[model samples]
Target chain A: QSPELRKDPVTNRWVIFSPTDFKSSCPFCIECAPELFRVPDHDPNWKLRVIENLYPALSRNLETRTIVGFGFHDVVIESPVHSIQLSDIDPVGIGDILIAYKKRINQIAQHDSINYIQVFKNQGASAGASMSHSHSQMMALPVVPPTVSSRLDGTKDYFEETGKCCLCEAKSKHFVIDESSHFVSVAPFAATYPFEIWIIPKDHSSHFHHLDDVKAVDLGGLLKLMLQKIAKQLNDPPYNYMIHTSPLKVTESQLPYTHWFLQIVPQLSGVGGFEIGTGCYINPVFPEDVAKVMREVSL
Target chain B: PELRKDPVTNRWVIFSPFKSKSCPFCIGREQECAPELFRVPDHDPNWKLRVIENLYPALSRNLETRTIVGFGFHDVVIESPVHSIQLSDIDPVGIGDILIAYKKRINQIAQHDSINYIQVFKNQGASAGASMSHSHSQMMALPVVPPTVSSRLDGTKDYFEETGKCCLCEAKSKHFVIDESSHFVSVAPFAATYPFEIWIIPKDHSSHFHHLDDVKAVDLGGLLKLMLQKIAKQLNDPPYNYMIHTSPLKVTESQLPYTHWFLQIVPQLSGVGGFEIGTGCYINPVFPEDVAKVMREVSLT
Candidate 1:
């Protein structure tokens, strides 16, 4: 009995949930574990645990039947040992799991009844990750999500007619018009997926838990050496890496003009019903041959 | 920066966390699995099985409902014109007249009470991403109640406030008979999200799959063609998605727990990414006891 939720009169976006929970209940059955679930320690005496999820979409108390709205869901055990995989962790354990995801996004952005903080990860079962154990997740969202309110209404209307900071002047005109050749591929000016790369921090830092730990250990050794040079030129493929940051209502004079980034993706195909009912994205591998194969691979 | 509501029913979601460096239909996987809709038997015949209309439609009667902010709802249900048969290759009297024309198109588009939910399903192939090798199925109708059916009706009201009874009649007394295929049976779910995902229930408490009958709809098409030939001899023909929960024919049966009647079937070789779309949470990587030892190691075919 799972799957239900429909709403969308005119872009209010919410759909499908009720179909009478299709009667074949398989909540990871096997006498359904000794309760308190989140099983995944392929052992090695464990290096990360974070349990609790027998089948929780959102419960923790339940009644608050909700007033305005918010969200919370966690499961970030990214290697506590055992066959370790965030591409075999190391870059100081991927900067200590990105500093435990910046201490759970500064404890979910000091929850004044939360607004937004959706850290994500679902790496392969196709891109859903119903467990190969390596993990990732963080969601303290109450609202402001529809893609972070359309990029916060396109970065507050480009910071109200350019007082500056539309992603820090588009990352300083993408580090002076990135002449694509890669030494860690740059090419930015609006890359809507398809070799859509972005790694930000030429300066302005909004939040990826405000880096600084020697730039989060040199941004985790330049993102684990540009994901091991795109998994040795796409053989160790199957991707999905994220980190966007900057919201929870920016301040400190708009957090020194915001901007924080990282996005990897890679899966390669299968999303019919027109990219899952219209979120619009067609992309047929052309980001200049994926920035010329992330500019000739070789990390 | 302040608009994420939905604690129980406040709805308003869109948290576009960006990350797209590759998946552009993986640069057309042979034209996305090609086969559009084929009934195939006698020669060419062009296409009797072509259902068109999902160029990118979440819900498109044709178009023109750009509400912008009032709320949302989308509809589309191509469900069969045939891209090479497979509902166990039809014909249990045409799968009981396509389950009475899919319960007469979910009772004529669920007489629009602004559709709270209605989602017939099918994804089959490309690990259930079936872009086109046809054999279709889909009928999405929504307006909210979905977040996986409000967390399975709040986990069947917290398992009837901690075990009073009915978590799907204790999951149909361990998935009713047929363990070695004639009709299929390899259940073990209280919460399983693929690793051989399979749920097919019908031991009892049937809240309208168009009120079953015609001998429980040809014994649900011979137990879904022996559970898709025992999940295509365990895996190798993977790629799946089978939905049919039933209830909002304008609600009743004490509002819910309308006695869970299942049919989930996931497969699609997993991929929900970004920690399951920012934490709805799931991570199965094959282990329902090795998906019931490769679906009871083909006891049938």
Candidate 2:
């Protein structure tokens, strides 16, 4: 049976219902044939590769009328060698992965059914990575996600009042922990998670795919520097990082209010009943203290 | 030091960072926390259940607080004196008394003119975000109706306007049931986020939990214990969180023709990743029907 997209009547959120029996073994070891790799196996020394997920939450087979799970899911293997983390990879290697992400997102945006694409990486077991391999995932969604949509609405409200982008004003130097030529990392005023950091582009842009190779490499260097500091200070905690960008399909009139950024949330604490029930969060650590820690770390 | 509201989402978050080496909810640690507001076995000197103000409150009743800071009430319900005992292991009568304590607290908090909503929830294990191992639950009174509850109320009201029936009442009738009793019914929701998630609703339409009669409380006690027992047996006592979802406190019973209160139990089998946190969408691995079948087949004994 095809995977189904079920919408909760109360919350109006979509859930991909794809049932599978719990597996007792690991299924993502590179030594285990690696048959799904999208790259041609021309040489034994492949730095990075993109592979199709073996058990995807959504696939391309969904027909428009069926209201089924119609989206694309792919795995971007960061390194050919297993156990080499994204934090450990060199800046040049990380840039190649970013290029791959841009390429895949741009390619998926060409599909008429796709409205949004999410590119995210889960580093360790506590961050929800079932496999220990260093890889990231991309999902082309059928609709604009609620989080992004709400953010856009908030941005529009801010623009109407101040006549400037909300995020552009949010880039005040008060919250900045570090900055490079292309990117500035800051601890947001209302972070949901402890030690959460956002990496915003110095030059405002709505789409990550609009980044050229030079900008991608610049972001790669900054991202590497931030990850290294976090790993050192937090004793290598599990974490998740996701790129938040505008929806794939948007009119020119709606473009100015959109801003694309990357957010990294370390798995420092568990989400309890209060957060799940009310959709409100209780963060133990203050963002100012978190930014102080980030600033104190030396490369 | 204070609660801060996210400007974009309008969600409030408590930033209190107090921690103690001792567990305040322990039986002998009453003096460490706030004095008891209500206790079960009222005549007996030794109480089986106790409700006390949260020592580290997320919200306060102090109106003189900062204009942007949150103001409300936070309390803790000590479910059992035994540290290792689970809710499934508790007697039906004890569970009923716990529910009574919840309702009593909710009623008391609703009397405060500033309070608009009360959330009663339980977190079982460390993975479920419980700092203390002792079996207990939490109740927080809020100055405003939360977004989740407001969305639910709006959805139910819309459904009622369109179909002339309550949404949750319709759900209880249409969904596949795992177990059913005279007073309560349990079903796996259509879009459950976690594995083996279940929703238990009362048969009689009641907008607020404070309106549950004594006999219904006893019946609900039995049904809740039975459901938890099934979950424990089937899922190996997985870490879980359960919350009571009810109508806003400010709404009168006559005005809430579309509301039906229920309890949502979400088993924490895994962590929520970026896909769920970023998009508000879930990728549930288990189907609701499969979860219901497992719950139905589990031996209650």
Candidate 3:
């Protein structure tokens, strides 16, 4: 079945549908993955590979002026070993994955009328991962999503009002978890989900695709540490992490306001009526308390 | 205890973790239930439905600040006195009674000047976050209009301002049409966020759900039952959630141009993940058009 992107008139949001076939037993395994999508490492020993999704939600051929049927969906295989997970990888190894994201995103950005790109990982089945393989997905859309537009507008509002990035002004000693050379991972002041950790660049960066190897490694260590901390503390619950960055095409003037951040949510609860109906969320665990717990985690 | 606004979206996040069940609201368990706000069939004991205060409300009504948030009400509507019957199992008139009860409570709640937004929603199964086995729905009246409602209001109003037509007034495709009634039409939305999602919308232009009269309530009740029954039969009765998306309490006639109320049924056929959480976009496995055709042919026999 082929997928098509359609728009909701009310909220003006778009959704891609037409179910893709399900798979099993780690299709991202390096040997089998190369046949399905892509590869290479230190010449042949590939640690990470970004490949076109075998069953893509959006078409890759022509690109866009239309909705989202014209876009790219990719899967980044983070490990060749099926049993291994992202948290188990070392900083350098995870850095390779981050660089792969930067590489692929930059490549997609230069193509067609792609307005936005999302990089997200669903670790367990409950978290929307069909396979146990350590992998993440990237979807390039022709339109800037509702969430992105809201973020852009809100950030611009803050900058216009105070001439400072809201992220730059983010603080609270209790909310801070770990600070690396280039990044800081902290529980947000108003977390929508419990144990929601955000890894933001210490310096303002508008786009995630602009990440360099040095910053990648710095973010890699902090990202890995956060995964392990949540895993050990939350009984290794299924979790999802998504990179929230600016739309591919950003105006020069919006540079001071648009800052990118990565959000990590350990699947501590299921979303139900109240949340789905209203855009508002009720997070049971306080962010400051969550930060305290993460800071205390010995790992 | 209080709402904190996220700088990026200006979303009011109600951070309270400081927090289920029984068939206590069932017919015989009346003594175990909270005090009734009112009941159907006047104040008689043998009733089709009843309304009561929420057992453990997130917001306390008595402790009212009367200024910035936290002053609100939460109530539950017992859809059925029967312990085993679900909402879809009831006849149209019975369902009509439930819908009317919502209107009645919302009518009463609107009298409070403090409440800004009123939401009515039903959680059907355990995984869908239903705390009890008994059939019931909840109404949460808030002092502030939530960001979701605000988004809808802003978006739809923009559409109306641009085109002079209510966005919902022009909704559907040939194959996307599910079913219809005299006063309502059910359709699989063009950009359905959930698989097999259905919306029972008012064919006539109306803003507030409470504006529903006896005739329209019974008419919508029929369509509501048909959608659920078809979903249960075709989709194997999966977990589901339905919400009445209506105008805020104090819409001063102007909102009527853009505010059209509809009941949205989200069948939980997919898991929401990082992609959805981050960007508010979704990947539905089945297409809305395909599901609409399937549901149209669903044998109610």
Candidate 4:
């Protein structure tokens, strides 16, 4: 299949789509070849696995007039056992996955063509998971996506005015549901989805790869606890979570203006026409209520 | 519930859930909704098309405020008296009447002091977020211009400033045209987020949908019906949503010399994942050229 990146002249957003036949039965399963796995020499009872996506939306060879779908797409199998989800895993196990993510992101960032890396997980069919396995994906793109750029611009603007990070100020407001040594989880003030939560590190960091071993472990514990609370409260609702960090090409001056965070958006309802037509969203649930529920839920 | 703006992206969200015991837009349930603002075939007791206020509105005239709670209008347009009939199934004349009703309501709502922008859209099927299965459309008169519309306005203005031409008018010429009629042309956009997406625009340079005359409305009706029918045939009546993109009511005509109104149709063939929601970038499996080819080949009859 020939994949192409087409730019929307109006909004300046790029859409990558494959035009020809590229079918795969199931490439990410454990039964797949070990050569395809990122950690091929892991223990037989490994808690997680990572592999390159056989059918990637973006590739490394294609290039055009500022319209190139050239990048990397990798799949991180959260568990060797298909049904065991991140919420079901131990904190140590989830921590291992986060460590792997950090390592892989750092490695991908070395490529000169890559400018941004998206680390995300889609938990159910309704959340756009083609496979039933509990897994996550990482897409290293040639350009910083619009959402990331917009957020960065906002953060930069705020920093220029207040001489402080916007996310740190938001964290200071005490919307936290759970907190660890390195991280604080809060329901964002303006959540676009119901039960939307953001996990921000206490220390300001521009990139996810900047996290140390201790912080990564702390993030793992906080993330697992938060996912458990959400599952218990929302009856194991389908959800998608992603890490929003600074772009790969961030300079030293950009570090103070950047903050890395994770956003977990529960797929409580379908996005309607109004959201698609307008960039504006209609969230049926309030973030304050979401925080209250998250705080009250027992582990 | 009140509206909140995201500090990072600066987009508004209405945080209210309006639940009803039954589908109010269904046949013989006219009393459940607000009284008809306008009805097609005026004298007929059994009106073919009717516009009424949204019972559970996201924005309201009563909720006017400075920053948090937005003040605006929301309405529902019952497309057909028959419950299950879709826009594709409706006759051309009925479709024209629906367009006429939209124009009348938009004109009426634009007169409100608070409304600066108006959005007319239809959500079909469960996936598209149509709470009721009955065929209908929605219109929201807003106190502020949405970011998406603002982006288009900026893009148009920038393009016009650079090239001295209407952006959409230039796009219509550059786009891969699938079908064209007397007044309207349907084409697949260069950047489509959804599979088999289509955009229909008037050939003439017009910034407002309410400016459509009866003759032009009839022509639009024919073109819209043909496109919908072709899409239905090719995609097997896929769930979809379409929205009319036009200039804000508050903008002067001179300020929008570069703006041209159009309709964007996004068929809901797949669920949006984290990548799309997180980054605002889309991964569409189908290419626009292929979509245009399929649309052009599909027989409307």
Going through the candidates in the order shown, the clash numbers are 94, 0, 2, 0
Q: State candidate 3's DockQ.
A: 0.24
Q: Between candidates 2 and 3, name the one with more favorable TM-score.
A: 3
In model 1, what lDDT does residue B261 have?
49
TM-score of 3: 0.88
* Candidate 3, true inter-chain contacts retained: 0.46
List per-prediction Cα lDDT, in the order shown.
Answer: 0.50, 0.71, 0.73, 0.72
Tens digits of per-residue lDDT, candidate 3, A63-171, equal 5301336777788888889999888888998888888888788678677577788899998889988588888988777667667877777677657777988776555
lDDT of 4 at B98: 89
**lDDT score for residue B195 of model 4:** 70
* Winning candidate number (lDDT): 3
For candidate 2, state the interface root-mean-square deviation in angstroms to 1 decimal: 16.2
Instruction: Report how far off residue A295 is in candidate 3 (Å).
Output: 1.7
- The reply for model 3, stretches above 4 Å from the true place, is A1-27, A30-42, A62-68, B1-22, B66-69, B172-175
Write candidate 4's Cα lDDT for B121-199 as tens digits.
9998887888778889998766667767776776667666777877568655555677888888888765556677788
lDDT of 2 by residue, A1-299 (tens): 22222221112232211111111113443333233344334445677777766666676555350135777778887776776888888888888888888878877877888888888988777777758878888877776766776577666765666677656655662378888878888877656666777888878788888887888888888898788888878777888898888888876776787778888887777777877777666655555677777888888
TM-score of each: 0.31, 0.86, 0.88, 0.87
Model 3 clashing residue pairs (backbone): A19-B285, A284-B17
